[PDB]
Design a protein around this ligand. Structure first.
Ligand code: NAG
Ligand code: NAG
Ligand code: NAG
Lengths: 107, 205
């Protein structure tokens, strides 16, 4: 069967400025496809699997094997980082799962 | 290895090819160094490839580079769904990108369901000769007598027009005389080879 996204994967994430942001992406039946993170505002490829494409060293994707979660971490989150992000499975055609990040200040 | 980032040398050329032919997009860079050329489809954001690794499971998509300045994306046997913009991207900070566009044209091809067969009709009758065609851009149909004589177009009010060709999918012949019997050719053309032509015999008794 073809891969798919866990629909429980949160579509709306809120991080704290200066802290790390975490965008989860749970995938089932990945097989030999890859899970990639894309930033929408400039269509910048961030990560492909555990590989990091962006030169912004704040980014890292981690494969959580126990939950099959391809989590994106954004260190030193800034207001500029807020907006829309895409988790993308390399099927043909691709599967996409949209996640919005919010960056706020405590209280 | 020192700090000055790569640059695009020239834009991505727009590409226009017919279904089943091969398309290549090229990204011309300078001083690429250790940065990597990425490719993706702009409209779907589908990642195609990074450096020499094809990421899409589309078997028709591959990559190559002529040299360290000339990075290619190859789309083999193009299809209608490959139509769109293809983004070349460098993992500099901040990122730099260029887009080229692929247009997928289709050569003319008749629709057998609504193209006329050979017909035998009484003198003085009216006949619709039809050749419907499909393709992109939309094909135009041209009618000609195979023997080079003129097609006779008439109105209800008693006037006839003699043209060596008639443009239109439906050739309407009315109050036909024996002089109009013969072989009619409809040619569907849209600039995308090959053109298609059907031969229709009109018999008038
Ligand atoms: C996303 O979360 C923020 C903070 O919790 C909230 O203000 C916003 O309304 C949420 N967006 C949607 C579409 O629910
Ligand atoms: C992924 O697995 C399928 C299984 O049929 C195979 O055909 C395909 O070539 C594989 N792709 C890669 C990149 O290994
Ligand atoms: C390619 O074609 C598109 C229209 O589909 C046009 O908007 C664009 O400017 C063209 N690009 C170049 C480099 O000619």
């Amino acid at each position: 069967m073809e891969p798919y996204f866990d629909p429980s994967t949160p579509r709306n994430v809120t991080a704290l400025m200066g802290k790390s942001a975490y965008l989860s992406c749970r995938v089932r039946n990945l097989a030999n496809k890859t899970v990639s993170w894309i930033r929408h505002r400039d269509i910048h490829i961030l990560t492909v699997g555990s590989y990091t494409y962006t030169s912004d060293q704040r980014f890292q994707a981690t494969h959580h094997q126990d939950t099959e979660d391809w989590t994106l971490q954004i260190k030193w989150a800034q207001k500029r980082d807020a907006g829309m992000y895409e988790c993308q499975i390399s099927t043909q055609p691709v599967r996409s799962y949209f996640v919005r990040l919010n960056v706020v200040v405590p209280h | 290895s020192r700090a000055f980032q790569p640059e695009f040398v020239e834009s991505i050329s727009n590409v226009s090819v017919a279904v089943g032919r091969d398309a290549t997009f090229t990204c011309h860079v300078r001083h690429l160094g250790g940065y990597r050329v990425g490719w993706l489809k702009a409209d779907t954001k589908a990642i195609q490839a990074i450096h020499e690794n094809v990421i899409t499971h589309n078997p028709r998509v591959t990559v190559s580079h002529l040299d360290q300045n000339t990075w290619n994306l190859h789309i083999k046997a193009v299809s209608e769904e490959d139509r769109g913009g293809y983004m070349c991207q460098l993992n500099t900070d901040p990122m730099k990108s260029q887009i080229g566009f692929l247009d997928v044209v289709i050569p003319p091809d008749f629709i057998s369901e609504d193209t006329s067969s050979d017909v035998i009709v009484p003198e003085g009758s009216s006949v619709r000769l039809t050749c419907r065609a499909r393709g992109y851009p939309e094909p135009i149909v041209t009618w000609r007598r195979e023997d080079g004589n003129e097609i006779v177009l008439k109105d209800n009010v008693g006037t006839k027009t003699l043209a060596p060709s008639f443009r239109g999918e439906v050739l309407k012949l009315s109050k036909i005389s024996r002089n109009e019997m013969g072989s009619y050719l409809c040619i569907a053309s849209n600039g995308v080879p090959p053109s298609v032509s059907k031969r229709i015999s009109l018999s008038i008794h």
